[PDB]
Ligand code: HEM
Ligand code: HEM
């Protein structure tokens with residue numbers, strides 16, 4: 001198994017959510033970006049990782065994409081402001097990928113900056 | 114599984130080389146970037162993916178890094194000019210990670226643009 | 227002239243905001259999209275066109291971009307949920323351009339769907 | 340004059356043809372999409388911008404529309420294959436608008452992808 005270590009030790013933050021938008025994977029790089037320990041994120045709705053002023057609109061965007069059945073995801077290709085646990089904000093770059101695994105719709109977000 | 118699909122179907126090209134600098138993984142995103150189908154890459158040396166005019170210097174950079182036993186990789190942090198099989202060139206963004214597994218040092222390059 | 231007619235009679239909604247984020251142009255295509263007649267938009271702030279739940283976050287995104295002096299705009303590259311005057315919502319496709327003229331920074335949004 | 344700069348610096352390729360289907364405006368974005376410098380296009384028939392295997396049928400479609408007097412243009416609303424100067428092809432999205440200016444029938448094509 002080299003794929004897990006590749007994402008686990010990746011320099012970029014990696015966030016993987018399942019079909020119900022729940023976090024199943026959150027690597028150390030991601031821990032440093034957000035300010036949350038992985039244990040505080042696993043199993044929780046992706047909502048807790050979204051900035052407070054985007055939480056109201058975000059769920060509509062995942063919903064729309066899942067209902068789109070399109071293998072292509074072009075979203076979040078720009079600079080986005082990530083809100084940390086302590087409330088401070090930093091600018092980042094996101095690379096979003098829709099992932100069909102175990103016969104379900106997964107999303108992987110690789111983050112940096 | 115979940116991790117293999119996360120890199121295989123990733124929007125970013127993914128290239129994994131083992132301890133012998135041989136390409137172990139090369140996703141579809143990477144095939145489009147370089148112009149090589151996976152069959153032409155897997156099992157071959159990393160040098161076939163390095164632009165011709167940088168092939169003379171690149172081996173020393175990976176070697177220097179492997180001998181450094183450091184868990185981090187600061188290199189390739191900026192835009193790199195990628196050269197395709199047909200010779201055309203495109204600018205790209207690289208995210209390089211050193212991956213330790215089963216006692217050996219691997220490298221995973223995530224690419225975009 | 228030829229350029230004014232090209233945007234005025236364009237099948238795509240066109241919205242131009244000046245350096246003060248005030249709407250300077252709003253074509254008929256845009257009136258149909260939003261549900262606002264031009265008289266209700268021209269001279270007002272861009273926020274009246276931003277869905278209510280995104281109004282809190284949108285100002286920081288334009289500001290961050292203006293402070294970036296970059297000629298490109300990578301944002302809004304994906305489907306956005308537009309909110310009409312009556313409150314109904316429709317999904318749209320945006321094409322955003324930063325326009326430099328007479329020493330000031332303007333933004334032109336071309337919309338469809 | 341903000342309308343010219345808005346089309347001139349637009350992210351989308353912009354192609355404006357006059358009553359005799361001759362190109363009068365061709366922006367930098369359009370130069371990158373087609374592979375032709377603007378100087379090579381101005382004054383020439385739109386024909387040079389049409390894929391070789393569509394050149395025979397295209398003229399019949401503009402003809403038909405001009406003879407239609409309808410302010411509505413629904414054509415080319417899908418994905419179209421654009422043929423570049425070097426002959427390679429890419430898929431694109433077109434937004435076509437019929438423009439009545441200076442008392443004549445103009446067409447503006449905004450392109451992306
Ligand atoms: C700092 C945190 C994050 C912010 C600020 C953020 C922001 C946004 C915004 C503004 C949109 C709609 C506009 C656009 O597409 O650009 C969006 C869409 C979306 N986001 Fe996020 N996001 C964040 C994290 C995530 C994570 C961790 C995932 C999942 C692993 C995710 C998955 C999605 C999906 C699936 C969409 C819809 C895709 C589309 O736009 O076509 N986001 N996000
Ligand atoms: C488009 C192809 C590529 C180009 C143009 C390229 C270019 C370079 C350059 C210029 C350096 C030294 C300067 C710097 O760090 O910025 C470098 C270092 C390095 N490259 Fe590449 N590279 C390419 C692909 C790869 C791939 C596919 C891997 C492995 C998965 C890789 C692994 C490394 C390593 C380990 C180093 C030394 C690490 C460090 O700088 O700290 N490179 N590369």
Ligand code: HEM
Nearest residue numbers: 078241243276287288291299300301302306308333334335
């Ligand atoms: C239906 C209404 C609109 C919605 C829902 C909307 C939504 C958004 C969102 C979610 C972002 C940040 C994430 C991203 O880039 O995808 C954004 C950024 C931005 N928007 Fe809007 N927007 C709307 C209308 C406009 C208009 C009319 C203009 C100006 C003519 C505008 C100018 C900008 C700029 C300059 C940015 C930052 C640029 C960048 O992301 O690089 N937006 N907008």
Ligand code: HEM
Nearest residue numbers: 354356388389400401404414415419420421422446447448
């Ligand atoms: C990559 C280049 C282009 C391709 C492949 C292309 C292809 C086509 C095709 C297949 C049709 C007929 C079927 C349909 O309406 O979908 C058409 C119609 C038309 N095209 Fe194009 N076109 C191109 C560029 C342009 C440009 C640059 C203009 C003008 C600024 C233009 C103006 C028109 C007009 C006026 C019609 C008739 C409208 C209608 O279908 O009702 N086309 N084109």
